[PDB]
Amino acid sequence: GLVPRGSHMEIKNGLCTQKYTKVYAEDKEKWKFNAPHHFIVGKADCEDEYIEPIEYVNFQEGPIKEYGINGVNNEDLILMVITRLQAFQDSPYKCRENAMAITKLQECLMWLGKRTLDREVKGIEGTSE
């Protein structure tokens, strides 16, 4: 594969291992709607010049009712992690650190949905303000 990396930016995170993969994203300049939406997970062992793609993740950009359903939502990915972390808890791999993480993630979901429910009490959902 080995596609080129010029526009892309490597999302580096001190809490992220970066041992076997890297995460890459669109240039800040190309960010649409205030945020990044086209991400690549690629193998770490590559020239800076190139990215070896393992996986592409694209998020919904533009409101759903104007542009259609053209990508995922943050909630969806979190669900996957939870589902899998709950599968790990229901295995020999059960540990405290996983239940801690599952709890944090559900509370994430909750906080985000609070934002939804509050923008719904005011009436306004997916609004320009």
Place this chain on the structure above:
Amino acid sequence: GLVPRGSHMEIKNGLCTQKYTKVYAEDKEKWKFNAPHHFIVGKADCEDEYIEPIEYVNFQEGPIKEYGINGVNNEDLILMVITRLQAFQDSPYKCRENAMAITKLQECLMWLGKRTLDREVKGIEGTSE
């Protein structure tokens, strides 16, 4: 463009809005290494028989030693969502809820990495032991 659901199971979570998208993964009977690894997010309004794919997210199955880098990690999806929310915090649409969610997700990474740092006191990281 629709694809057959077949073995795939809808991952439904009460905490997830699930308005315009749905998440699926391989049947539980098909899971390798205790966990689902092949998720598909698809449009909600669809045939219950069919899945309308929007994105396919596939996770690493197996020890990298003997199976290679064949998938994404939970840490990578979460890096994506942390980055997007941090972007949203540079915007008109900064809010407390996002701040809380970023703090939750960061704490979720910390717990996972504690698992890993404890496996790295014992040198058994990236392995199946």
Place this chain on the structure above:
Amino acid sequence: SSGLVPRGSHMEIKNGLCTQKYTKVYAEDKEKWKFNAPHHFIVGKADCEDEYIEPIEYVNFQEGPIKEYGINGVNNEDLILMVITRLQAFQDSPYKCRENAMAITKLQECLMWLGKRTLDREVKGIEGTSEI
């Protein structure tokens, strides 16, 4: 004297986190609890003798599932909404502080966890019911 009722079968809810400086909270005795919980509470003043309760306020909770018994009283979420509302007002005053913001956060997280339980009991169709 006309503001006193006897303690009787009432219990003092004592919690080590609660100051009891001016008030004491009472509830009905355990034997009388119905539906697995205390539903009848009294806040009274601290400086009366233990034989009596000097009631400031009576808060009575919903006793029994609604589907069968209707609306007897308040729900935990209602009292928590009251307290959040006041704390947020204090935040929006000269007396804004960090401890109030923390307590607002904790109370909201509490509403969220109670909500997750309710949402799950809705998917199932068991909300408002005695079914577990």
Place this chain on the structure above:
Amino acid sequence: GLVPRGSHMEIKNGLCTQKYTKVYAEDKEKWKFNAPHHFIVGKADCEDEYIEPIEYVNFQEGPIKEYGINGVNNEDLILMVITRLQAFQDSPYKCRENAMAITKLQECLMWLGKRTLDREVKGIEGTSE
């Protein structure tokens, strides 16, 4: 058993579904000392012109050595709810959501109290300082 709503404001909160009950407080114009003090829980299935009172809850208004003990503290209501949830934990309705909420309420009490304690070190509690 109706009463006129009148000046009373309805407490609408994205986190509070209002399925069965509606909380009202005193008109914002009538709030003494920066906060509402006189709440009504009424039946939700009622028209805006009326409140169907299920319960009245009145909070400590004014300084105590000036107007007397004339209502309840936040701590007291939180204590009731902690008591009930703990009682539910000791029943077939025990669950992890209840446990999480109980933990949250106790940490709420801890934070509110810090304030009192900190001020007490500075000599000033029961007072306005």
Place this chain on the structure above:
Amino acid sequence: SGLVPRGSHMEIKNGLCTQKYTKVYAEDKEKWKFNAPHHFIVGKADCEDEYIEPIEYVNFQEGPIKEYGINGVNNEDLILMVITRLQAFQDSPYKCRENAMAITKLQECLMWLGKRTLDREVKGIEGTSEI
């Protein structure tokens, strides 16, 4: 010299601690009284496993105070030192969010330990060996 023999002492290792310039040691688990370690050493990490090059000694209270009297520090004392220093670091050019989050965690740690103490006071068992 400046080194003393490791001997009975056990290195305390935690993945979450960097352990770069220091090492934490306790008395040997076989020698713990009252169910815990109470005699800790912080020593130079770049010494040699057979020795301990001691930087600081920290001794905790061994035995309930209402039975044995005051003879060492409480957890609460050390945590308060850390909270103090972190708050200083917040009131400086190096104010940051991570320090903020650690202060919040440490204060919640104090509040939990406190509830226990408070409940025990109601029950009359504070400072005692009772459960």
Place this chain on the structure above:
Amino acid sequence: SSGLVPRGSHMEIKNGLCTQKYTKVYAEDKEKWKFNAPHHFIVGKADCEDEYIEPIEYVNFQEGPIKEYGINGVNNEDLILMVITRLQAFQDSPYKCRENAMAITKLQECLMWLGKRTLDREVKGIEGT
């Protein structure tokens, strides 16, 4: 040899979350604080008159860069490690309780956040400065 020293410029650390039932905690004068912080502390008996401090223990923190003044104190991380070790030992005894469990989760999360500051100054390559 009264086990008693003069208070002097030392300041008393009075924090509302500390009872001072048995011990008082002191530190160097704010004026002698170096590098924005207190690095020399004393734990002393409470009953002692204010003019004096009765020492029980002394704690001293790394003061200045290890590079030019050497190793001359402890880290915060070290005292938190001691406390976590003790509380986990207590959880393995008739004295197990839920408050200890919480306290440990808090202290672990505290270590994780401090770790995150350092991991960030590493991915930023300005660590130790």
Place this chain on the structure above:
Amino acid sequence: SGLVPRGSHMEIKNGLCTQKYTKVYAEDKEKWKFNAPHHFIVGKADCEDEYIEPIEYVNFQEGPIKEYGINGVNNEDLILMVITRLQAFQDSPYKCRENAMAITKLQECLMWLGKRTLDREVKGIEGTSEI
């Protein structure tokens, strides 16, 4: 309704069993094949005097399998069922020491019956009528 004549069925009574709600019956001892009862019924205990009210029928293997096939269940299959259910109750609000002790006793039952099979297999007589 849902009744069957009691007929030749014997009732199994052991003091260890209460019989408050259910009663257990098997075929008359004269009719036992292979030294053992094989056909059991559980019936409602509050039943008319002539009858059995069958809640469930469980029939066990008649014969060595190798000679006659699989005719039925084995003791191990029921004990497994019971261990599965009790463990589930433990992951429930109803967890008790008593259930735990039982699951331990049932697992040890399973281990003992197991030794016999393994020992017999070394001797090549499992599935046989040989002693």
Place this chain on the structure above:
Amino acid sequence: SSGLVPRGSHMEIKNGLCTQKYTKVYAEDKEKWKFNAPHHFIVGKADCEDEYIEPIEYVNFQEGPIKEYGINGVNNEDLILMVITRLQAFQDSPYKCRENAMAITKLQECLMWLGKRTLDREVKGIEGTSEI
């Protein structure tokens, strides 16, 4: 066509203590469990294809506490009693052995421990109900 029935949601009870040489045991899917337990069991012939069951027997356990839902399935102590009876038969015959003796003792102690609970709860007047 020897009685093969689709497996479906059924879960194979795969326990390290059961050989699976002749028979397999299946319960209903975890997702389906009521009252916190599996209640609908099948014993199937083991030498079969993993998407099918060749049922030898069906065993239905009491769903719901008896005083609330009535008598609608077997109890654990019932199955234990059957096994004890058959092993005591085996002991009075050429096939007597220590292993059977041991196993009988184990199962009697099992019944005794489950009994304590029933008795304790009977002293509490909560046996047969859904009270903890």
Place this chain on the structure above:
Amino acid sequence: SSGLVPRGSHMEIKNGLCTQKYTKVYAEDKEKWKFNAPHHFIVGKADCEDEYIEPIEYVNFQEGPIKEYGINGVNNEDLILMVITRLQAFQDSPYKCRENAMAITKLQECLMWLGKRTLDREVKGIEGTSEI
């Protein structure tokens, strides 16, 4: 000295599991045994003169089957119960430990086995009587 009785025909109960460090246990002479068992026990201080018993406690077990003779003493289950109660109280104290936990489980199982005997004698109607 004070509080002594003569050693008399009393037999010492010497059991290799009992350390005799502070106390000794005696019973009536084997030849004075009514109903196949010793009924009259004495705990005495272990450090008394040779010809003497220094009693700390006397314990008299029920002589004669219950239904035919009445009630004249205590039963084994009563002592076992005392011991279980004290060991539980100890587990609920700073002295909690695994060896107590084990012991309590043994004592309870002891009671259960004696109970099985009682329930089987009652399935025969012969409880408290001399019929085998």
Place this chain on the structure above:
Amino acid sequence: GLVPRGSHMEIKNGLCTQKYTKVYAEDKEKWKFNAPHHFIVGKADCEDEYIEPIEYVNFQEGPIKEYGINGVNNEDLILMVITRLQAFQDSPYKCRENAMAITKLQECLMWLGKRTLDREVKGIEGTSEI
């Protein structure tokens, strides 16, 4: 002859039939050294207010090395029960149940004796140290 129950607490267990006898001890309020020490076996057939004492049983209160010898020890009672049941075995009433009980009772003694031995190595036997 009866006595007032008063503070005394009935000790009731599911495992005790209470058919003929009842067991009482002092109010938990009054327990010294974290345990009941003053037990009374009375007759079952009596009103809740009154007790019909068949036997008093006093247990050692406080570590022996610090308060002296003042009551029985759990081990003494267990020994009595073992002795009687063994005798029953040398009788026509020999049963498996009694035998298994002796094993349970002997094993109980063995666990209690572990603690004592371990405490002896520690030098804390019959002292109040943990």
Place this chain on the structure above:
Amino acid sequence: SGLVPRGSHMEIKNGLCTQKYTKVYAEDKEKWKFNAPHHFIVGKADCEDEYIEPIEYVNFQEGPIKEYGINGVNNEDLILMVITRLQAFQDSPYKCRENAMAITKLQECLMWLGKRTLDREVKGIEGTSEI
């Protein structure tokens, strides 16, 4: 490692013991002094049928303890080692229920063996040939 003739050595096949990698062998039964085997070998089970491939030799006391003094180990020493190792495992990631159960069983085995000792010491005849 290396081989030794199989010869008179008897394999110890017990059904509960897996023999996956290792076998256990002992002297021939006619060579048993004092009613019992005393010389045991643990060999690799993966070697030619005529050979034994030692990993470990174990020689138990042969002789009257009182008369011949010390000639080898006692069953109690091995059980003490195994208990120690299982406790170690319990203080590690390897903690599980099965280990706790086997530690309990082994301690009770030692307590039964020790009962025998204490009784032959109430009768004065320990370590001697007297029945």
Place this chain on the structure above:
Amino acid sequence: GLVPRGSHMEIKNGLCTQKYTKVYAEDKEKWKFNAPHHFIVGKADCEDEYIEPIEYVNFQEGPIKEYGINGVNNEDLILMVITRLQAFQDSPYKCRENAMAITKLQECLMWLGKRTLDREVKGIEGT
């Protein structure tokens, strides 16, 4: 034949008598794979300074399939003891206490084997 105690630790349990033999093992620090693996049985009256070996026992270190077969298993020792005790029960020294011990040791073997078969079902065996 005396080797000094050195690193070795003395294993003492209230349950074991220590009258004639003493069990020693490697120091905690040298423990590999979280457990002791090298044991020495030695004479009791020997000085604390030294150990007089009577036998040496080396338990399998590391995963059997990665580091080879280099020690004995618990299973193997317990089988030796069961075997001797069963010999004793076939002799005039037959007694109930040995029979109890044989039963305890067999249930021991059953619980360890359950750990194994539970790795086999769960597929994680020997790692």
